């Protein structure tokens, strides 16, 4: 007996939530690109070792771990498909700030995020085709957004390059600009948490299911651990290890929601309509825990 | 394709998009053009 709120899409609270999300993204990207250099980005582009290992880790671990979790946990056909689309999605921009929290060579982080988004728009239908075989004999190849991906990539790169230019041109705006941006980010985050709690209501109890919670808990943690292990095994720098892992662990869950909404009616995808939200909150919690653990470990090294 | 949504990296709902004029939140969201949805009779069957 799963029932969505009577007016979910059309409500002042939902429009407000979307507006604050957009503002959060813009200000986060501006204050996050305010700590990069063009020369380091060019150097990372000209040395594609880190980008290659990051892409290999993402597109060979996340879809594979989603498929293995779906097979092991004996999920339904729709449930096993929902996790698979999340696994095939590109790494989100949360990885950039998450790596910022661990001093992780931000130029490599932004390079990996951009190239991962491009390779996603290139090869996500291929991964879906070769991994979905067995569930949903349907196509699902024309449901992944294509122009939207590149438009979003450009629209998130614009504030990043604006911040980079601001840092390179005149640095005395940093203290005034950075603090304000941070303040905006904190206010927007508390507002977005409150608004999400208000909008979701008591309907979140329906989608928690022990299996859904379990898979959405292991998947980001498994991604983090596997990415770190692979980066360490490839004899990479300690700074690059953290960013590679915490990029391969994060995912862009908006694509999974949009594709599922386009392909299937809401009633078919009822209980797992909130799966992207569960993945987002679980990955946020695990990232915060990892950041706290790393900071405590660094405090031990003084 | 049939999907013309501008994804938001920090988004978890279909209406979380980067479109300036938030038509998704209005009463006529036109970001999806697939009325030929699949009911998937064996969606809830394991294997």
């Amino acid at each position: 007996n799963f029932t969505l709120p009577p007016n979910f899409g059309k409500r002042p609270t939902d429009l407000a939530l979307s507006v604050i999300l957009v503002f959060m993204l813009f200000f986060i990207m501006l204050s996050l690109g305010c700590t990069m250099e063009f020369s380091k980005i060019k150097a990372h582009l000209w040395k594609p070792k880190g980008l290659a290992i990051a892409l290999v880790a993402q597109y060979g671990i996340m879809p594979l771990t989603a498929f293995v979790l779906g097979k092991v946990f004996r999920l339904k056909n729709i449930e096993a498909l929902a996790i698979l689309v999340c696994g095939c999605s590109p790494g989100g921009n949360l990885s950039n700030v998450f790596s910022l929290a661990m001093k992780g060579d931000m130029n490599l982080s932004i390079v990996m995020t951009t190239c991962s988004t491009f390779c996603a728009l290139g090869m996500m239908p291929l991964l879906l085709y070769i991994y979905s075989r067995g569930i949903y004999d349907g196509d699902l190849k024309d449901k992944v957004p294509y122009k939207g991906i590149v438009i979003s990539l450009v629209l998130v790169l614009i504030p990043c390059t604006i911040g980079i230019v601001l840092k390179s041109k005149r640095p005395q705006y940093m203290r005034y600009v950075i603090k304000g941006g941070m303040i905006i980010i904190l206010l927007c985050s508390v507002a977005v948490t409150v608004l999400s709690a208000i909008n979701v209501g008591k309907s979140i109890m329906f989608a928690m299911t022990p299996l859904l919670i379990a898979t959405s808990s292991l998947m980001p943690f498994i991604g983090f651990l596997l990415g770190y292990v692979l980066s360490a095994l490839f004899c990479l720098n300690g700074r690059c290890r953290r960013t590679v892992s915490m990029e391969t662990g994060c995912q862009n869950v908006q694509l999974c929601s949009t594709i599922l909404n386009v392909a299937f009616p809401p009633e078919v995808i009822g209980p797992l309509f909130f799966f992207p939200l569960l993945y987002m909150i679980f990955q946020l919690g695990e990232g915060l825990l990892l950041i706290a653990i790393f900071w405590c470990y660094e405090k031990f090294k003084t | 394709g049939t999907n013309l949504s501008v994804p938001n990296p920090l988004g978890f709902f279909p209406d979380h998009q980067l479109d300036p004029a938030f038509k998704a939140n209005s009463e006529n969201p036109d970001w999806d053009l697939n009325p030929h949805k699949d009911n998937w009779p064996d969606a809830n069957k394991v294997g």
Epitope: F2 | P35, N39, D42
Partner: antibody
Framework: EVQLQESGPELVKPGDSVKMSCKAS????????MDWVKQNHGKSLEWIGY????????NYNQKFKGKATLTVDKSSSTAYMELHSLTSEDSAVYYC???????????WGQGTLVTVSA | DIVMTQTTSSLSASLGDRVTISCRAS??????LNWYQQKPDGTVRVLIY???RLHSGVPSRFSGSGSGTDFSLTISNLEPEDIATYYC?????????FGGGTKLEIKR
């Protein structure tokens, strides 16, 4: 072969609610949508709404939102429809249809005739 | 709300002649129209879905294709069993409206 059986003819005074039953058979029931279609005396069809048997999700037409409630009773595999406050304007045959895969009405019932008079 | 209109309310067909039932849409729907046949004793049956595909069971003589706002349903040779009321339904928008008015009869 899938076959749908309806409750039968009904006769209700104005303002007294009625219920329509649609006994599904020939398939496992809880994987296909059930849509209800109302035909006027002249012979013009209007789509009322649908119900998902697996979770009871419903969505009605704007006109019929006030006076249409859909239940499934998955144990007996017989969908129901209630009309609450019926006036003399609504009458004639109501059909239950089973939507198949893509959005088209595949198999229809024989139809239930409803007459409202005092 | 899309208003579905059918050009003719009653059509004469005789026997062994093909009748093209024309359905016109208020706005563009782009190949999201279905066809239904209602015999005189109720028993509504679906003939064509997605405007080009025959439902499993209907005779192969039923056909008809169209795109945009103009649609057709061809019957080819007409048997006495194919004397009924034919409806065109769209599902481009949620209300799912119907045509509602095409009837067939024998010429004499």
């Amino acid at each position: 072969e899938v076959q749908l059986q309806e409750s039968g003819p009904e006769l209700v005074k104005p303002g007294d609610s009625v219920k329509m039953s649609c006994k599904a058979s020939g398939y496992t029931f809880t994987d296909y949508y059930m849509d209800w279609v109302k035909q006027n005396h002249g012979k013009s069809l209007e789509w009322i709404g649908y119900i998902y048997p697996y979770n009871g999700g419903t969505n009605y037409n704007q006109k019929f939102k006030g006076k249409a409630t859909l239940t499934v009773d998955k144990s007996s595999s017989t969908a129901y429809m209630e009309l609450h406050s019926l006036t003399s304007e609504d009458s004639a045959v109501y059909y239950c249809a089973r939507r198949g895969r893509f959005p088209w009405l595949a198999y229809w019932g024989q139809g239930t005739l409803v007459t409202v008079s005092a | 709300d899309i208003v579905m209109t059918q050009t003719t309310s009653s059509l004469s067909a005789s026997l062994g002649d093909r009748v093209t039932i024309s359905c016109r849409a208020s706005q563009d729907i782009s190949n999201y129209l279905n066809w239904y046949q209602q015999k005189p004793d109720g028993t509504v049956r679906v003939l064509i879905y997605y405007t080009s595909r025959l439902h499993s069971g209907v005779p192969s003589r039923f056909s008809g294709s169209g795109s945009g706002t103009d649609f057709s349903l061809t019957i080819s040779n007409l048997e006495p069993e194919d004397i009924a009321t034919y409806y065109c339904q769209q599902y481009s928008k949620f209300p799912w409206t119907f045509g509602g008015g095409t009837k067939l009869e024998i010429k004499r």
